[PDB]
């Protein structure tokens, strides 16, 4: 999308392959704010908002928290409390066309600044003079939306950077999007510290003949202690027994 018509998609109810994006490294700028590139990225996210817009290379710096500029104040504002990553990568082959591609537009002037998630699609001509414009473009009336004009042979500062702003809030109570969570392998027949789906315990794993219902993860026998647990890695039910101990 163009910068003025910033396109939003909601990433909901899916696990996310955060690690592979880092592995790709096709992005020139990876300035992440608040979440950082860490294990914190690979954890529960309430909502994930993806925003795409093709901007100038020089204006990439502007779309950072607490920064000001034309793109910042007239096209897409930035949350000062932004928790998220800003990616810019060169689209010179893809988004530059011979003789210029004049389809991506930007708002040079606007009446006031914009809210952090403001999508102004208005075509009303900006007025800077005592004379009302009345829909005719003249002196004291200059069209707000101007065409950047990316050219194939131009500096990278004057070449397109596709930007996919990814907003992640850190409360994580809904947890609609989560990371892979680094599942391990099975090591049964020895005393081990087990943590199948969130219950830390100590004991030895063995094959279980119990048939758990599909909505049940772990099982408790008489006197309210864990007896069998189903690992969701391969929907396998395993019997937990304490490893050998006794007096001497």
């Amino acid at each position, epitope marked *: 999308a163009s910068v003025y018509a910033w396109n939003r998609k909601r990433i909901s109810n899916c696990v996310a392959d955060y690690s592979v994006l880092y592995n790709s490294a096709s992005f020139s700028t990876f300035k992440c704010y608040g979440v950082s590139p860490t294990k914190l990225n690979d954890l529960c996210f309430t909502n994930v908002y993806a925003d795409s817009f093709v901007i100038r290379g020089d204006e990439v710096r502007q779309i950072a928290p607490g920064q000001t500029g034309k793109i910042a104040d007239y096209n897409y504002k930035l949350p000062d409390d932004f928790t998220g990553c800003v990616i810019a990568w060169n689209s010179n082959n893809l988004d530059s066309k011979v003789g210029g591609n004049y389809n991506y537009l930007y708002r040079l002037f606007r009446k006031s600044n914009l809210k952090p998630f403001e999508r102004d699609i208005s075509t009303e001509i900006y007025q800077a003079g005592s*004379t009302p*414009c009345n*829909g005719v*473009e003249g002196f004291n009336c*200059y069209f707000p939306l*101007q065409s950047y004009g990316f050219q194939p042979t131009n500096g990278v500062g004057y070449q397109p950077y596709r930007v996919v702003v990814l907003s992640f809030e850190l409360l994580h109570a809904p947890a609609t999007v989560c990371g892979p969570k680094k599942s391990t392998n099975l090591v049964k027949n020895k005393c081990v510290n087990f943590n199948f789906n969130g219950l830390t315990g100590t004991g030895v794993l063995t094959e279980s003949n119990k048939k758990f219902l599909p909505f049940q993860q772990f099982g408790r026998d008489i006197a309210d202690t864990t007896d069998a647990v189903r690992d969701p890695q391969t929907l396998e039910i395993l019997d937990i027994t304490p490893c050998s101990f006794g007096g001497v």
Partner: antibody, heavy 122, light 106 residues
Framework: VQLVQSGAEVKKPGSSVKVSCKASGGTFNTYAINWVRQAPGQGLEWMGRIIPMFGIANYAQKFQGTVTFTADKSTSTAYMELSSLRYEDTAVYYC????????????????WGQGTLVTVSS | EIVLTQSPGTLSLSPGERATLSCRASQSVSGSYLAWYQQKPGQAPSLLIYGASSRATGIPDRFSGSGSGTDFTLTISRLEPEDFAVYYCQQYVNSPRTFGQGTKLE
């Protein structure tokens, strides 16, 4: 670069007509399209402009409610519709292109079409 | 709304000397948003100048503007017989952009 339009209209009075100015490749998106009446044996009158990309048409006080401007993003063709043929509506309509962008000198009609003749007959 | 009156309305014959055909407006043209046009008989107008003096592609620099405020000059080095077209003025300011009445109409 070349803006072939309609040539002549055979319209009995009160019967509507649509003009078919054709924009060349890259003309519609970059430049707006303007319409000029050019009444017979008289001067040039600016009817209005079509901004094709955003579909915005704004008219002068005189022609408001009597003429309709439309443009087709696909096939790059500019259209002007006359509501009905009033007796004075006879003319040689012209289509021309200007640049909305302020960063390049614009709003002046760069290039013009051949002209569309509306009359009582041929 | 802005009005324009061209002053040398008609020159019947071609003596070939330079003519300083003019345009005047009720409110002074702001930022020199005026353009001249060449309308040869039987054909569409062609842009001749823009701004106050900026020339045009494919039109020789013999055509010279010399205006400010109430922009009022379009001059030519010599008057060619073939190059005898009605010349129009259109403001491109926020007003209705209504052309003048023409300065070379036979």
């Amino acid at each position: 670069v070349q803006l072939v339009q309609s040539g002549a209209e055979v319209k009995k009075p009160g019967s509507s007509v649509k003009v078919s100015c054709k924009a060349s490749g890259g003309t519609f998106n970059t430049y707006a399209i303007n319409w000029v009446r050019q009444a017979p044996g008289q001067g040039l009158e600016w009817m209005g402009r079509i901004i094709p990309m955003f579909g915005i048409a704004n008219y002068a006080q005189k022609f408001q409610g009597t003429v309709t401007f439309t443009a087709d993003k696909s096939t790059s063709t500019a259209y002007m519709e006359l509501s009905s043929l009033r007796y004075e509506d006879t003319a040689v309509y012209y289509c021309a292109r200007s640049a909305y962008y302020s960063e390049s000198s614009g709003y002046y009609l760069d290039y013009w079409g051949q002209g569309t003749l509306v009359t009582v007959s041929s | 709304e802005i009005v324009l009156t061209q002053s040398p309305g008609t020159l019947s014959l071609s003596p070939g000397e330079r003519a300083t055909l003019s345009c005047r407006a009720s409110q002074s043209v702001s930022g020199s948003y005026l353009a001249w046009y060449q309308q040869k008989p039987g054909q569409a107008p062609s842009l001749l100048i823009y701004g106050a003096s900026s020339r045009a592609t494919g039109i020789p620099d013999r055509f010279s503007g010399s205006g400010s405020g109430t922009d009022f000059t379009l001059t030519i080095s010599r008057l060619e017989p073939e190059d005898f077209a009605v010349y129009y003025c259109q403001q491109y300011v926020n007003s209705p952009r209504t052309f003048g009445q023409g300065t070379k109409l036979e």
